[PDB]
Amino acid sequence: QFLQWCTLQPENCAVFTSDNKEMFQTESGLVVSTYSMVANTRNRSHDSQKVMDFLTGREWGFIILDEVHVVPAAMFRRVVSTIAAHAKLGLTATLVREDDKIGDLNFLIGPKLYEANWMELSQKGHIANVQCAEVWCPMTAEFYQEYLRETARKRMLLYIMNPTKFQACQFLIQYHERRGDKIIVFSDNVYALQEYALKMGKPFIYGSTPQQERMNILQNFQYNDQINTIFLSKVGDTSIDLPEATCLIQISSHYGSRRQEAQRLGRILRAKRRNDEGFNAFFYSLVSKDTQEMYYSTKRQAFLVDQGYAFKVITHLHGMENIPNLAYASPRERRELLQEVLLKNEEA
């Protein structure tokens, strides 16, 4: 994502994994490594051990670190004693970390010099004003009594499959194309994703998709203007974040990982920077009423208040009643979706 945009040539920075065997003890220049390979139980091959031996051999005058808080400081101290380096560097992310042990990694490396003052950073122009909104779509009486009779996961299949959610999705899809804004939808469920991605005519990047079809959509999204609504699972957000699309729609949400969805949503807003005058980055969440997911989605918006982002509530936008292209609006299509969901609950 950056080091080739940066001046770094990866020809010397061999990436070692203990699986991604690379050139150790022969790299003419600097190297890029990872805590898992450097010192962890994930020493699957002796490539990591050879990298550590070479690291001991050469007095590495400096070390670059990224998010060491997650990795315990024990391996850090072990490799500090093993390598006997000249200098290091800590690119921290949190004020308080689990690696603040008796031997602080600060005095192991050096004093503090700068603090990631997010109030200074997140207001001068990068995020382009987060507008956290949650579309309060209605629910139905046939799916509610069948929702209460299900529990232990097989109950989220009745929550996500809602006929008014397709009326709120196709309305926000046609609303963003009139303003000339691309859409980058997100989700959690696998199946429930392909059923909403195939009917709307929106190519998809999901689990176990071949990369020849994965990069073709990125060539039809970054160049072609006909693909302004893409559907990505969890692979297309943790691998490459797009700096375009100032309108984000969240449909499928998982419990517990509401902070992991907050880390995913935060990486998209940080990638979208160009300092525009408006630059209104809209965020929507199609949450159905009296379901167990909207009450966990309030924990996700509570993390955004902790980041300083403003959150507003939108019950319904005055315009969805005038869209005749909303699928599952007729009661016949709502009963056909009920039979398709009742067959999905019988399969799961």
Partner 1 sequence: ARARKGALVQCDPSIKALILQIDAKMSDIVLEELDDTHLLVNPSKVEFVKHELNRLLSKNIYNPMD
Question: Given the rule CB under 7 A, which residues bind DNA?
Answer: 17-20, 36-37, 40-42, 44-45, 70-72, 153, 234-235, 238, 255-257, 259-260
- Interatomic CA distance for residues 105 and 107, integer angstroms: 6
Select from DNA, partner 1, none the partner in contact with residue 313, using the beta carbon and a kind-dependent cut-off of 5 to 8 Å.
none
Answer for the pair 330, 336: CB distance below 8 angstroms, yes or no: no
Burial category of 15 from C-beta neighbours within 10 Å (exposed 0-12, middle 13-18, buried 19 and up):
middle
Select from partner 1, DNA, none the partner in contact with residue 138, using the beta carbon and a kind-dependent cut-off of 5 to 8 Å.
partner 1
Closest distance to DNA from the beta carbon of 133 (Å): 24
**Site size with partner 1, rule: CB under 8 A:** 10
Closest distance to DNA from the beta carbon of 41 (Å): 4
Closest distance to DNA from the beta carbon of 121 (Å): 21
Q: Does position 321 bind partner 1 by CB under 8 A?
A: no
* Choice between 224 and 260, CB closer to DNA: 260
Q: Does position 20 bind partner 1 by CB under 8 A?
A: no
Answer for the pair 229, 178: CB distance below 8 angstroms, yes or no: no
Q: In the structure encoding, which two tokens stand for residue 238, read together? A: 């943790």
* Choice between 102 and 148, CB closer to partner 1: 148
Closest CA to 136 of 314, 339, 17: 314
Closest CA to 267 of 191, 188, 184: 184
Closest distance to DNA from the beta carbon of 165 (Å): 21
Closest CA to 186 of 222, 116, 235: 235
Out of 19, 59, 276, 290, which residue is the one contacting partner 1 (CB under 8 A)?
290
* 135: three-class secondary structure by DSSP: strand
